[PDB]
Ligand binder design. Structure first.
Ligand SMILES: [Zn+2]
Lengths: 264, 243, 231, 236, 230
DNA sequence: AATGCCGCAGTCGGCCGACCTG
DNA sequence: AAACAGGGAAGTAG
DNA sequence: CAGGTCGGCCGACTGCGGCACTCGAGCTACTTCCCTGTTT
DNA sequence: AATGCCGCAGTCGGCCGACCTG
């Protein structure tokens, strides 16, 4: 019976429900039969997997990328550096981008925020060139690269790009500004001291100030590396797409999407 | 340890208190470390400021430097500008607001650009009152830092050097009490809501701390060292309460 | 890229051996091998054992091959014939060379299913019962041709065994011996966006997987969003 | 269990530790296996320093010349018997030794004229191997002890067959006190799953990896593993 | 054109044979042979016969091969083994297939040098005492792999033998069968560079015809630019 | 050489002081 | 005669 | 034993994305490598 | 002068019979 289903699929490539209704077989059997055929296309609409890590302490993990504000003319190359714990953002408008420009932007950001433990960027040639590497080595800052051609690896700074562009458009429509430096300074001022969240905290109050530790709950936890629901474990942070469990035996916090977290 | 302290002082040349508080060195030891360096010789934050324009010859064309200092935390921001006219002062004001925030009022001198109607109405828009020995001190400090950072002449433009100097003065230089300028400026200064507990590292076998606690439970505590990156699970036998 | 020329001239191994033992460029190794004139589960589970004829050895034309079906570890001898006596001798030496497996899938030759061999295999707790064995045949013939001045057929035959086992390795860098004494996934490319595979999965964890296509040289990191379980 | 060990040592004459680890028996059980059996009464890393010498076996006759190649680190023992001990003979044995083991660097030999001959030296130098001038004789004692055990086991057509059997029993299936055969020392999670094609819980069998909720369960199918969602797996 | 396509699909002959049978362009023959997925003194003087294994014949993997050294005429019958009885049967069937030789060349296998075979050959006034046979083996294996669905091994072997013998012709257009029943130094008069050696077809009264193996057509050159070889 | 994200805006739902009313 | 220093191409990633 | 339990079963639900008329070209930017004019 | 849809696959969960045990 099942082999007849297999050969019928190999001939026609029917639908799973078609096989189930025609040959009186278990639905999961039809799903596996349609899975095993090389000819049938493989799944592309995969649900969310993985998550961008973010240091639980301010000034630990940053992100960095460039963009293009064509309204700035010769100064269209904008460098954006945003922390991951607090979403504190900083940006400058440097003509072009290179080792010198990235170094100057890095020094400005360091002055504006502080020493970061490590920085995660894309694989642009400037961030891969050695000069930046020994600069960070002298400044004792670890560096990460990220998978090539994967903007989701820098999704945080990409969303920050969205925010910055929206703010710049708003301000430019509002009035007149001398130079793109002035406009960018105003936009960063708004985004970092005025654009408060819904918890009574500006960007400054989050990046600086005290880390808040209310009694954190414990939840069931699906460990993707063993295909099992192991727990309970302490939940450090959570949000719209991320969760940070921390089992006692685990050496470091583990980042998993929300749907793999079940309350207990 | 202390060799890394000497390396850090070579890179930045901060005050001795910063070294002795960040690397657990003996106070006098950090004192000679600073000495051996060749070039080393209000009531609330965001309330009252002072602004002046100074001159530094080393920049040459950008000798017009604006200095903006808070009177409670000494949080210092500065910029090298091509002119002392009204427009450059306005640009520096906007960038200083981006750096530090909104001050209640700014105290300045009688410079003709400052008195100009444009600055008055700009401060009127931003609701910042204008009124006509802390910043001349800052002029010395920034000038001194520029001299010490001139050891490594790899700075492309005066912006790079000024950014490095402001970074040191605002995030690395610590007071005699153990606080940087940025912490005072953002003023989380209050009684600690959460306990700060002692911690006994396994690798060294010594009580290192105090460090901030996160959680606890079932024989373990989730301590989070200041210099570390991720929380460290520690048995309760090596955890000591601290006030 | 200095010693590679003489190493190839002596052993005539594949370009993978050059690039992994001498830390040279892949294109460099390809050029070296092309320019050369003479170069134109778990281990010990299932075995294949066939006889082949080579005319070079003369009256020693009866080569017996015994290739493991997992690690492709290869052993061979040259004997005066292919009778039960001879296959028994070669089987004893193959066991001395590779240990004790449990299944040897062999062909239906009368000497292979004779009595003496049958109780001999029964005593040592073995079972009974193809492209692997003929592929190994082609490799052995190619290596024997590439070895052209040796003393006796045993000499260059042992040399061919040595270069086939302890010198050559696959794309992963693991030689035949290392595979013998030391995952299959559909993945999506990121440049074109079209799926390619199936390919081997070195290791993975927490949203990113490592894929080593057999036609490429370096491992590829892909996000777990683009990983499919082939078969 | 016991009778399997009895047959194994009777037709094979293993030592005690390897048999114990293979069949999970009492230590005594193996000791009286040894007693009742009538026929059976340095470097830092593998493949660095080798020792080799010739020795004479009485019963091999025209093949009395026994060449022995033992790795000084792991004691992985390899041996062959030939008609002579000349330069051609030593070269042939070196060829088969390289076939058997791999590429050494350090070789220690005696002061034999063949070993100090120019042909062997140039051959080794061509293969990037350095030749310079207890282990060898104790290895010879072990080899000939295995031989003395093995004659009465059964028919051995040629001394090559007997020598191969002896070296195999001495290297690949015998082991040390640490459950480690010399051969592998030279190179040194069961699950229950649902075959959801047929709906039967086949197993247990080894697991390989995991991820995406998918467990790479590998049955005795020597062709390829299969993927099963983790909802259809249970630890054993 | 299409007839050439179906002929190559059925028999899978070489390009030269297809060209000579169906009168097509040599470029067309090369294209058609490349396109197919399945494509990757006198006669009776001296013979060579060596046995070889073919795995996919199961019990009958011991296939014998006898090739005449003159015309490369080939013969093969898969049998039970390579023992005395099997080699004797194969030799008798080869004699029926191909004709009486004078000399046979074999290796030193015990079966060949066995007393019975020597006595039988002496009974037939035929004496008995190395790349052609291996090349023939390679050709036969290639044809066996190329011919793929047939019923029995004898059927497939006979079909492959027919294709290799009575269908494939060489550059001269002569079948191996018809061939079964001189070197010259020639000057390429265009470039002026000597070439060869090659087979002479006809020559006389100042002009000669030379057919190099790499040329689709005969080349006519004068007697002034022809020199012997060996 | 190392993993999607989240603000703008809608909206359900509960808290609760005020207002109807048994 | 071997060494050494520009420049262009090329691979590669944003 | 039958009330209680667990697994097989699948109804119902949902996160995801690309169908849209077709595909590109090119820039900046750094590294590695080969080639070649210049050196002792 | 006229408006995003939905298959694929994973998954939650309720039903129900074979099965355990009060
Ligand atoms: Zn070669």
């Amino acid at each position: 019976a099942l082999e007849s289903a297999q050969e019928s699929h190999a001939l026609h490539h029917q639908n799973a429900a078609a096989l189930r209704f025609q040959f009186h077989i278990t639905r999961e059997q039809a799903r596996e039969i349609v899975k095993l055929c090389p000819n049938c296309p493989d799944w592309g609409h995969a649900p969310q997997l993985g998550v961008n890590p973010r240091g639980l302490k301010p000034r630990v993990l940053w992100q960095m990328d460039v963009t293009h504000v064509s309204e700035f003319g010769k100064l269209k190359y904008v460098h954006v550096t945003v922390d991951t714990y607090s979403h504190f953002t900083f940006a400058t408008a440097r003509t072009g981008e290179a080792t010198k420009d990235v170094l100057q932007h890095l020094a400005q950001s360091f002055a504006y925020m502080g020493i970061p433990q490590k920085i995660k960027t894309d694989n642009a040639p400037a961030y891969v060139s050695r000069s930046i590497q020994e600069f960070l080595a002298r400044w004792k800052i670890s560096h990460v690269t990220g998978i090539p051609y994967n903007p989701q690896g820098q999704a945080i700074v990409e969303r920050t790009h969205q925010n910055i562009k929206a703010q710049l458009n708003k301000l430019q429509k509002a009035g007149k500004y001398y130079t793109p430096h002035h406009l960018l300074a105003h936009a960063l001022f708004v985004l970092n001291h005025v654009n408060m969240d819904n918890q009574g905290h500006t960007a400054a109050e989050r990046h600086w100030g005290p880390i808040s530790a209310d009694p954190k709950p414990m939840v069931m936890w699906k460990d993707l590396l063993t295909g099992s629901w192991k727990g309970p474990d302490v939940l450090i942070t959570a949000g719209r797409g991320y969760a940070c469990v921390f089992p006692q035996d685990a050496e470091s916090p583990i980042w998993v999407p929300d749907r793999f977290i079940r309350p207990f």
